[PDB]
């Protein structure tokens, strides 16, 4: 049937998911994920949106600030709003798959709720597509792929110019932080392309 999602876990607990369209396929993913790494993910959610102190308290305020200072939710919402339904199904499926398990967990806390939630004194809540996009956006984009030290570099340069003078200051800057180094081991041999 086009209404079914099958779930098969191998020897080491690894889920394989079997389904006939995009929404149900990722709904399955969401479901097995909420079983395996609920908590890891709830906390990844909060990390990636700077909503950590909401439950862990005063210690994580600067972190929350830092995160939210470092993106613009509305851009992410606009991007999602501007997807096809086919693409939008991936996210909405995932979020609902997760939400389905959480409903069961908030229906059998005494047998299903991961201990951490009891230990850290809060309960999991429902996921929306924005939340699931941000797991990726707030890690892969906003951590890795978000590297500058251009301000520090300028500080360094001005300190070098002060000692050494202007022309030599820059020459030393080039010696410490070259743009490009001809002798660098490259993953694509020079015979093939520059």
């Amino acid at each position: 049937p086009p209404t079914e999602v099958k779930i098969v876990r191998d020897e080491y607990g690894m889920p394989h998911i079997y389904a006939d369209d995009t929404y149900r396929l990722f709904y399955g993913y969401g479901y097995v994920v909420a079983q395996d790494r609920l908590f890891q993910m709830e906390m990844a959610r909060r990390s990636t949106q700077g909503t950590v102190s909401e439950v862990l308290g005063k210690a994580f305020v600067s972190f929350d600030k830092d995160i939210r200072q470092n993106y613009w939710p509305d851009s992410i919402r606009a991007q999602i709003a501007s997807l096809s339904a086919e693409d939008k199904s991936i996210l909405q499926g995932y979020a609902d798959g997760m939400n389905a398990w959480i409903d069961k967990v908030n229906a059998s806390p005494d047998k299903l709720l991961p201990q951490q939630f009891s230990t850290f004194g809060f309960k999991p809540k429902h996921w929306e597509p924005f939340d699931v996009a941000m797991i990726f956006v707030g890690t892969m984009a906003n951590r890795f792929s978000d590297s500058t030290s251009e301000i520090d570099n300028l500080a360094l340069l001005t300190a070098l110019k002060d000692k050494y003078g202007k022309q030599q200051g820059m020459a030393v800057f080039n010696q410490l932080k070259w743009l490009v180094n001809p002798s660098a081991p490259t993953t694509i041999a020079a015979r093939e392309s520059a």
Partner: protein
């Protein structure tokens, strides 16, 4: 992050092999999630960080893919001009333009809420403001607006079935990431993916630029310029976050350099020499690299030269002679706590002294300390990520090559003294510190071993598990957080593809309310350290053969 991909000509008893070691630190529960997807155009296996929709590490039966971090310069900083008579406005193309601003309130459990404003310009979010200079710093990202595009590109590549179809996705991936390809036919490929800015001529991308308009990006460069290679004459593709392509510029990070000294050369060296590699041998590169001292190769020549004319009894010589006796691979003793050889400790001490004497001494405070690190700095609980050649080492190395280096030495890092004099001074210091701890006989030095910790906090430093759940491995290993191998057209196996992975500490992070850990909470931890692996299953048959549990849901919308 590392990877080696081995082509038809370089593979043995197979057509292609792809070995992938992404480095993101070590955590518990495991950083990546194991998942198989079957339906709606997808037939895939592997694993992926934070259970993203797209598998960053895996295969679909025909091809396989993977990633290492790119470190291209896809971020710049724009110096916005403001006026004291206009809060929230910046000058751009001769007119005063309004900043976007939102208000955020942070709810604090058992605490008073804090509210503040995020600002945003044309170029990006504001990262700092200097009222004194009337300037605001805005962070422009080439991938801005293409975040979810990139999420989706990761996913759709899983459907591709050849180089053309797959590169079409690669072009839609905007984050600065290295992408790797292998297939059943034994073709191998590489693409240094991402959006990268078309800069104005004269734009130095290591420093800020004015945001008043004339230095705005022209646009983005085309995918055509992104470095890429398909079936290279080398027979392999190897990467350890090193430069993708001759004359390609790296990230503007001061602490990051692609130069003469690069750890990828440790992989190159293993791979050259053996003309062909079976699967087992290709997976065994992990062990070899896991334990390789990265610095021995770079400095031992200078050390030998420097101590040749000393007496055989000079303790400085005893140190260098002992290093020369070493294969540069670290192993732990039976005590589970010290290294069989003392070579890393030696190099660390020497290099620390070496750097203070050269680079750091050439750089004004408080900046010199950016270059003071040897690369070995750790605690009981171990490094938190990969080991690498430090920035300072790399810069020193160029100085030791002298005329052999392409980088003009505007300052003589040796302060007009022979290199030899300094090298010895540093050896003296190392000998001084080490002998005081371990005594005067290098053969009786049991130096400390690096350990490994699976941390209960995620890389943000935010708890993702209880403190107790953190796990200790006796032996630190300069390897992937996970490892996976895909083998193509194995002449032995029936199936067209074989694939293995390892997801330590285990697939599940579930602990019941009564405290009972899942059966798959810890069951790959010992496998990890062992350099072991588990098989990855794709076909419905194989997945049925190794079932353990089965659930069926009726879903709709």
């Amino acid at each position: 992050c590392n990877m080696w991909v081995i082509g038809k000509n370089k593979a043995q008893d197979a057509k292609a092999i792809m070995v992938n070691g992404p480095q993101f630190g070590w955590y518990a529960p495991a950083y990546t999630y194991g998942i198989g997807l079957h339906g709606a155009g997808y037939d895939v296996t592997g694993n992926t960080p934070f259970a993203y929709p797209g598998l960053v590490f895996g295969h679909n039966g025909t091809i396989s893919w993977g990633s290492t971090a790119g470190f291209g310069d896809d971020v710049d900083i724009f110096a916005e001009k403001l006026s004291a008579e206009k809060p929230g406005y910046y000058q751009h193309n001769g007119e005063w333009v309004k900043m976007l601003s939102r208000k955020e309130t942070i709810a604090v459990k058992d605490g008073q809420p804090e509210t503040f404003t995020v600002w945003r310009t044309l170029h990006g979010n504001v990262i700092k403001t200097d009222t004194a200079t009337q300037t605001a710093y805005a962070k422009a990202r080439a991938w801005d607006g293409k975040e979810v595009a990139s999420l989706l590109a990761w996913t759709h590549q899983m459907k591709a079935k050849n180089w053309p179809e797959w590169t079409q996705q690669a072009a839609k991936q905007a984050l600065t990431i290295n992408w790797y390809y292998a297939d059943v036919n034994g073709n191998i490929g590489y693409v240094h993916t991402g959006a990268y800015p078309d800069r104005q001529p004269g734009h130095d991308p290591r420093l800020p630029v004015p945001g008043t308009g004339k230095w705005d990006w022209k646009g983005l460069l085309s995918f055509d310029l992104n470095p890429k290679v398909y079936n290279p004459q080398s027979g392999y593709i190897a990467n350890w976050n090193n430069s993708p392509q001759k004359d390609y510029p790296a990230s503007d990070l001061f602490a990051f350099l692609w130069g003469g000294a690069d750890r990828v050369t440790e992989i190159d060296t293993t791979l050259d020499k053996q003309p062909r590699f079976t699967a087992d041998q290709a997976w065994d590169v992990i062990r070899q690299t896991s334990r390789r001292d990265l610095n021995l190769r770079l400095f031992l020549p200078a050390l030998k030269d420097a101590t040749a004319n000393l007496a055989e009894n000079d303790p400085r010589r005893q140190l260098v002679d002992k290093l020369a006796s070493w294969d540069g691979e670290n192993l732990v003793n039976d005590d589970g706590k010290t290294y069989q050889q003392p070579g890393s400790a030696i190099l660390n001490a020497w290099l620390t002294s070496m750097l203070k004497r050269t680079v750091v001494a050439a750089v004004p405070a408080p900046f010199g300390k950016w270059y003071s690190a040897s690369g070995y700095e750790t605690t009981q609980d171990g490094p938190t990520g990969s080991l690498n050649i430090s920035v300072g080492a790399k810069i020193l190395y160029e100085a030791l090559q002298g005329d052999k280096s392409p980088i003009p030495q505007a300052v003589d890092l040796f302060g007009g003294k022979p290199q030899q004099e300094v090298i010895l001074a540093a050896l003296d210091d190392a000998w001084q510190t080490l002998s005081k701890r371990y005594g005067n006989d290098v053969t009786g030095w049991k130096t400390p071993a690096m350990a490994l910790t699976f941390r209960a906090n995620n890389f943000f430093g935010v708890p993702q598990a209880a403190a107790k759940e953190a796990r200790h491995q006796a032996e630190y290993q300069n390897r992937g957080t996970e490892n996976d191998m895909i083998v193509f057209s194995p002449t032995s196996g029936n199936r067209p593809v074989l694939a293995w992975d390892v997801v330590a500490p285990g697939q599940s992070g579930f602990i019941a309310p009564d405290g009972k850990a899942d059966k798959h909470y810890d069951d790959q931890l010992i496998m990890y350290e062992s350099f072991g692996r588990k098989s990855l299953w794709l076909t419905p048959q194989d997945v049925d053969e190794h079932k353990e549990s089965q659930e069926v849901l009726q879903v709709q919308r």
